[PDB]
């Protein structure tokens, strides 16, 4: 399952960060190994967001990052959505009637300082 | 004489009539087809060409279909030759099924061992280590390369390199059971190879 140049707790930190991005942004540029490991992790989060209940919420909250916002919203207030609240109010209901496969990867180009092959991973 | 081709499924257990526990290996062999008959007038020796395991048809090419056409079958994945079998008694089109063997029937079994990669002299050849303490700097190494006088190393000095992947046969195994409607043979013991790998079973040479 792809060690990614890191120890066991740094791999977990890095994945927890890259999947909370893409929940907040829905489209991201990364290398090609990270993108595959992340497709697996993010879709595991979406099938908990579709389950809906309290037990599923507390299961996801062990993996989604906390003090991050994702706001395009104002009726009249400063009303913030929490990137776990988005998972449960927005992204689950979106993919209600689709079975697995909520993402897709495209290949672009090697990075200048590296020759690392880069990639875009998006949702629909 | 008797001999069939099949694939490896796995290992299990079984109790006998008296009530002993016995380890076993399941081999699955759907019917084999005779594709060609080699004789002394044409080829210079006597043998039989057998095919096993039907193949989808985008995956073969035109020379293979022409070779399989005279026998009225689908293209096959595995084609071997079986020697020392009184020819007669055989003709292109025939099917060899597992009821060629019966319980008893001491048999030989061949396959290709699992692959393991680049391995050192200790795992590859059973060589022993050097000491782990007492000032030592000689743990996991292949030994001295020879004496001084010939100004070179002799052949068959054994070293590191790629391990596994060779063919191996094991002699004098027993057929514990034969099941015809499922195309299955049960053999007592363990066989070489991985799962889904080709296995050949012949009656035994030492009788």
């Amino acid at each position: 399952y792809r060690k990614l140049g890191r120890t066991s707790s740094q791999r977990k930190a890095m994945l927890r960060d890259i999947t909370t991005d893409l929940i907040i942004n829905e489209r991201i540029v990364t290398t090609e190994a990270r993108a595959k490991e992340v497709r697996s992790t993010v879709e595991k989060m979406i099938t908990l967001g579709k389950r809906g209940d309290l037990h599923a919420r507390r299961q996801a909250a062990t993996f989604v990052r906390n003090e991050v916002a994702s706001v395009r919203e104002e009726d009249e207030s400063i009303v913030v959505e929490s990137a776990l609240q988005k998972l449960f109010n927005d992204l689950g209901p979106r993919f209600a009637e689709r079975q697995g496969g909520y993402t897709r990867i495209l290949k672009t180009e090697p990075r200048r300082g590296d020759a690392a092959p880069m990639v875009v991973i998006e949702f629909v | 004489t008797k001999g069939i081709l099949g694939k490896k499924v796995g290992m299990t257990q079984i109790f006998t009539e008296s009530g002993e526990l016995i380890p076993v290996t399941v081999v699955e062999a759907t019917p084999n087809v005779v594709l060609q008959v080699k004789t002394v007038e044409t080829d210079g020796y006597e043998a039989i060409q057998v095919g096993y395991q039907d193949k989808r048809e985008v995956l073969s090419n035109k020379p293979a279909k022409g070779h399989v056409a005279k026998a009225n079958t689908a293209p096959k994945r595995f084609i071997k030759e079986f020697k020392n079998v009184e020819l007669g008694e055989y003709e292109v089109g025939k099917e060899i099924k597992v009821d060629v063997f019966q319980a008893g029937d001491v048999v030989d079994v061949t396959g290709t061992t699992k692959g393991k990669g680049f391995q050192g002299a200790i795992k590859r050849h059973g060589q022993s280590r050097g000491p782990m303490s007492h000032g030592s700097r000689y743990h996991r190494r292949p030994g001295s390369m020879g004496p001084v006088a010939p100004n070179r190393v002799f052949k068959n000095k054994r070293l590191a390199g790629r391990m596994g992947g060779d063919r191996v046969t094991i002699q004098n195994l027993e057929v514990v059971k034969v099941d015809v409607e499922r195309n299955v043979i049960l053999i007592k013991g363990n066989i070489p190879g991985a799962k889904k790998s080709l296995i050949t079973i012949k009656s035994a040479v030492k009788a």
Binding site: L106, K107, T108, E109, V120 | -
Partner: protein, 56 residues
């Protein structure tokens, strides 16, 4: 261990015959014609598989 003899020009160049570069599968885009790497997005126009991808 140290080289006991220097190596000549012919032997250096005979070593260096498997030391080159390759330029593997390059095709023409279906949308804009220019050359591009297969199974990749086209860098000239941002089209992959007959649709627009690097746009919003």
């Amino acid at each position: 261990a140290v080289p006991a003899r220097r190596t000549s020009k012919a032997k250096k160049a005979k070593r260096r015959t498997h030391y080159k570069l390759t330029i593997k599968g390059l095709n023409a885009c279906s949308n804009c014609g220019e050359m591009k790497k297969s199974h990749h997005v086209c860098p000239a126009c941002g089209h992959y598989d007959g649709k627009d991808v690097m746009s919003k």
